[PDB]
Design a protein around this ligand. Structure first.
Ligand code: 9QD
Ligand code: 9QD
Lengths: 337, 339
C-alpha cells in the first residue's frame, strides 16, 4: 500500500481472476454502483453481489492483501479446473450478470449496460439478387483475432472484413435458392468501457488441444476507432485511452498472471502481482507486453470523453452505513476465528 | 445554455434570493446526483418538494431556455413576497434540504445531506472560581458570520470563537454554586465538505426599529484556511476551503437585485447568474467587487473543502437520472407544452 493501492492474496490456483478483479475495482463508476446494491437481506455465503461488495470494500480500505475465498465460493469456482474451463470474459460475465440483475428495480439499474454494452449489426447481402438480412446485436466484450495480425488496427480491419459466401458455401436465400453472398459485421456504437480479449489461445487440431500463441501483437495507448463506426459523431469521436493490460507469461494455466493499470487514467502505471503492487514504467505496462512468452491477452480501453465519469472519485461516503456495518462485523468474526 | 453551457432561471415574481440558492444547490453536483436517486415515483406531482426539485435540477441540466419555478414554490407554499420577507436565505435552504433528506431515509443515498453540509461544534460555559462546566454538542449546516466592525472573514471567525466574560451584573447562574464569574464560547470540532456562510448584513437598528442592510466593506478570500479555528487539526486533511459561490444583493430591501456568482467546476472560471441571463465574468467581478464599501455585495458564501472538491463537483450526466424519472418529467413537459 506504498502506492495507495493494495493487492489480492494468492489463494489457490485462480489464474486470471485477481487480474480481472483489480480491473473491475478500478472501474470506479461500477464500484460505486456495486456499493448501492441492496444486499442487506442476502445470504452472506451464497450471494455473489455481496461477495463483490466485500472484496471491493476490502480493496478500498485494507492495508493488507485482500482475500477472495468467499467470492470464489459464491459462484462455485473453487477448483483450478473451473478456471481451466472458462475464458476470462466468461468469468467477467458471471460477475457482471449477477451484479446487473441485483440492481434491477433500484436507483442504479442499467449501470452495467451503460458502462460495457455496445451495438453492432451482422449482415448477409446477396450479390446477384435483392435480398439482405441485418441483425442488430449487443456486445459487452469483443474477441479480437491476433494470429497473422500485427496490431489492434489490423485486428479491427479483420473483424469487419467482408466474408464471401460462394462455391460450396453459398447462402440459402430462401425463395431465391442457393445464392452467392457477402457476410460481415459493423459497429454501431462503442461503450464507455471497452473490454477487448485477444485470441491467443487457439485450437491446434493436431494435438486436439489449445495452444497459446506468443506472437508479437502491438496495441496503442491511444486507440482511434471512428473509422470502424457505421456513422461517426463529431463532438464525441471514438477515441480510447488504455486503462488495463492483463498479462500472462508462459504457455499454460501454470503460468504467471499479472495486470497493469493506470487507475486514474493519467498514464501513471502500476503492476498488480497478487499481493505486490508496485509502480512501473509505461513501457513495461505496454510495449513489453507486445510478445514475440510474456504478453497481453485482454485490454481495457475507456472512451476519452467518458474518462472523468467512469473514473469519478469513489470514497467512503459512497458506502451505506448498513453495508459498512455488516462488512465490519464480518471481519471481526473472521479475526475471532 | 448557449454561450456558457449553463442555463438560467426565469424571473417569475419576487422570489428574491431563491434563484441564487437554486443555482448554488444545483452545482453541488454530489447533492444533485443524490436528488436524482430519490424514490419519488409515487409522489404527488404538485405537493412534493423532492419531486419539485428533481424537476428544476432536470430542467437546469437539459433545458436551453430559462427554467420556471412555480411548481417548486407552490410545493413548499412560498407563493407570495411575504413568505420571502419572513425568512433568511438559510431558512429556505433548510426547507429544501430537510425535505430531500427525509425523502432519502431508508434508501441507497440516506445521509447525503449531513455528509455534505453538517459540521460539529461545542458550546460551553466555564466557571472561573469553581469547578463547574457545561458543554453542549450541536450540529450545524450553516454559519452566520458577524460583519459589523469586521474587515474580512478571518476577523469574523476570530469573533465567532471569542471568549465572552460573564461577570459583574452578568454572572452565570451556577445552580448550587450561586452566581459565578464565567466565560462562555464556541469551538468548532469539524467543518463540512460544503460550507455555507451567511453574512449578517441585515441588522436590527435600534432607532428606526427595523432591520437595515449594512453595506460595510467586508473582504473574503478565494482560498480560506480554517485550521486555526478547529479544536484539533488533522495533518492528513487540512481545513482549507475553496470559494464556490457568492450570493449578492444591491438595494436596501427585498425589492432589490439578487444575483449569484459561481465557478461551477471549482477551477476559478466564474459565471454570473442573473435569473435568465448567465454570462462569463472575471474573478474580480465575482470576488473583490462584491466586497461592498449602489453596487451589489455578498450576503452568502459557499466554500468547498479542497480535499473534497473533486468529490462534491464530480461529473453528473444524463445517465445519472433514472429512466422512470426522465419519462415522468418528459410526460410533464409535454402536458405543459400542450398548455
Ligand atoms: C494458457 C492460458 C489460459 C488462460 O488463462 N486463458 C485466459 C485468457 C483467455 O481467455 C484469452 N483468450 C484467448 N483466446 C481466445 C479465443 C477465443 N475464440 C473465440 O471466441 C472464437 C471466435 N469465433 C466465434 C464463433 N465464430 C463462429 C467464429 C469466431 C475466444 C476467447 C479467447 C480468450 O478469451 C484464454 C485462456 C492463457 C492462454 C492464452 C493467453 C493467456 C493465458
Ligand atoms: C434586504 C435583503 C433581505 C434578504 O434578502 N435577506 C436574505 C439574506 C439574509 O438572510 C442574510 N442574512 C442571513 N442571516 C442573518 C442572521 C442574522 N442573525 C442571526 O440570525 C443570528 C442571531 N444570533 C446572534 C447571536 N446570539 C447570541 C444568538 C442569536 C443577522 C443577519 C442575517 C442576514 O443578513 C438577509 C435577508 C437583504 C438584506 C441584507 C443583505 C442582503 C439582502
Amino acid at each position: 500500500k506504498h502506492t495507495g493501492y493494495v493487492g489480492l492474496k494468492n489463494q489457490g490456483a485462480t489464474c486470471y481472476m485477481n487480474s480481472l478483479l483489480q480491473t473491475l475495482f478500478f472501474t470506479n463508476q461500477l464500484r460505486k454502483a456495486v456499493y448501492m446494491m441492496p444486499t442487506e437481506g442476502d445470504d452472506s455465503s451464497k450471494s455473489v453481489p455481496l461477495a463483490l461488495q466485500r472484496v471491493f470494500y476490502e480493496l478500498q480500505h485494507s492495508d493488507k492483501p485482500v482475500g477472495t475465498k468467499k467470492l470464489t465460493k459464491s459462484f462455485g469456482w473453487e477448483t483450478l479446473d473451473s478456471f481451466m474451463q472458462h475464458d476470462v470474459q466468461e468469468l467477467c460475465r458471471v460477475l457482471l450478470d449477477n451484479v446487473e440483475n441485483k440492481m434491477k428495480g433500484t436507483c442504479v439499474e442499467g449501470t452495467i449496460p451503460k458502462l460495457f454494452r455496445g451495438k453492432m449489426v451482422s449482415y448477409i447481402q446477396c450479390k446477384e439478387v435483392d435480398y439482405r438480412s441485418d441483425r442488430r446485436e449487443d456486445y459487452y466484450d469483443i474477441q479480437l483475432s491476433i494470429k497473422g495480425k500485427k496490431n489492434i488496427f489490423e485486428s479491427f480491419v479483420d473483424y469487419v472484413a467482408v466474408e464471401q459466401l460462394d462455391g460450396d458455401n453459398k447462402y440459402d436465400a430462401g425463395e431465391h435458392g442457393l445464392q452467392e453472398a457477402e457476410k460481415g459485421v459493423k459497429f454501431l456504437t462503442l461503450p464507455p468501457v471497452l473490454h477487448l480479449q485477444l485470441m491467443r489461445f487457439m485450437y491446434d487440431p493436431q494435438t486436439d488441444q489449445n495452444i497459446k500463441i506468443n506472437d508479437r501483437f502491438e496495441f496503442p495507448e491511444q486507440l482511434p476507432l471512428d473509422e470502424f463506426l457505421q456513422k461517426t459523431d463529431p463532438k464525441d469521436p471514438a477515441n480510447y485511452i488504455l486503462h488495463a493490460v492483463l498479462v500472462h507469461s508462459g504457455d499454460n494455466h501454470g503460468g504467471h498472471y499479472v495486470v497493469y493499470l493506470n487507475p486514474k487514467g493519467d498514464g501513471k502505471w502500476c503492476k498488480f502481482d497478487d499481493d505486490v503492487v508496485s509502480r512501473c514504467t509505461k513501457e513495461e505496462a505496454i510495449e513489453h507486453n507486445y510478445g514475440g512468452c510474456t504478453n497481453a491477452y485482454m485490454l481495457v480501453y475507456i472512451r476519452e470523453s467518458k474518462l472523468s465519469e467512469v473514473l469519478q472519485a469513489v470514497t467512503d461516503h459512497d458506502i451505506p452505513q448498513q453495508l459498512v456495518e455488516r462488512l465490519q462485523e464480518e471481519k471481526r468474526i473472521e479475526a475471532q476465528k
